[PDB]
Curated annotation (Swiss-Prot), chain A:
Belongs to the NGF-beta family. Highest levels in prostate, lower levels in thymus, placenta, and skeletal muscle. Expressed in embryonic and adult tissues. Target-derived survival factor for peripheral sensory sympathetic neurons. May promote ameloblast differentiation and subsequent reduction in proliferation of ameloblasts. Transmembrane segments: none annotated. It is linked to Glaucoma 1, open angle, O: A form of primary open angle glaucoma (POAG). POAG is characterized by a specific pattern of optic nerve and visual field defects. The angle of the anterior chamber of the eye is open, and usually the intraocular pressure is increased. However, glaucoma can occur at any intraocular pressure. The disease is generally asymptomatic until the late stages, by which time significant and irreversible optic nerve damage has already taken place. It comes from the Eukaryota. This is Neurotrophin-4. Disulfide bonds join C5-C71, C42-C95, C59-C97. It is found in: Secreted. It comes from Homo sapiens (Human).
Length: 103, 113
């Protein structure tokens, strides 16, 4: 399905650091399986395509007549084996549109 | 200065998720408890973000989104999911780790035009 901010999703296999629930940087263990995270970010601009819905651009479909918008990454907490123990860490889970304005 | 979301969200620690959709589309059972994932035993819970359920205007779950140009676009605020590894079950109680789906955000979808 088509959205207002084009998302790009994947498996993060090399995350070694992350900011935890307290605002601090914690070491992310490389394995436990082997420790992965499912991450979601915004699409980056593409020179053949252009137009809206990308990474730090105006969101597809918003009315430019009344609004100024921006696709930005949204974060959530995932349980992670860190350093040693399970800690909640911030990972990118979506590209959401924000209306910062009132054109 | 006063940033508004296009779709309103509600986040929180879910401690009652008992079912989920796994990575391949199957519905599985999600356990409340995890016996030995760490060095120690622990309670299984998730950090989820889903749409707010609402007359009083748009930007609510199932509704049109805030700030979308209603002239050209049919839209809708819907939960969007990410995969997380979780202790689950399937056969008659055959437990194991599975990548499953959780609500990670409420996003504005563009249905047509
Ligand atoms: Cl959005």
């Amino acid at each position: 399905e088509l959205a207002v901010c084009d998302a790009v999703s994947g498996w993060v296999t090399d995350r070694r650091t992350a900011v935890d629930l307290r605002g601090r940087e914690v070491e992310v263990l490389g394995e436990v399986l082997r420790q992965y995270f499912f991450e979601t970010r915004c699409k980056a601009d593409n020179a053949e395509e252009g137009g809206p819905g990308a990474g730090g651009g105006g969101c597809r479909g918003v009315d430019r007549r009344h609004w100024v918008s921006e696709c930005k990454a949204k974060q959530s907490y995932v349980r992670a084996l860190t350093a040693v123990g399970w800690r909640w860490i911030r990972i990118d889970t979506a590209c959401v549109c924000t209306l910062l304005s009132r054109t």
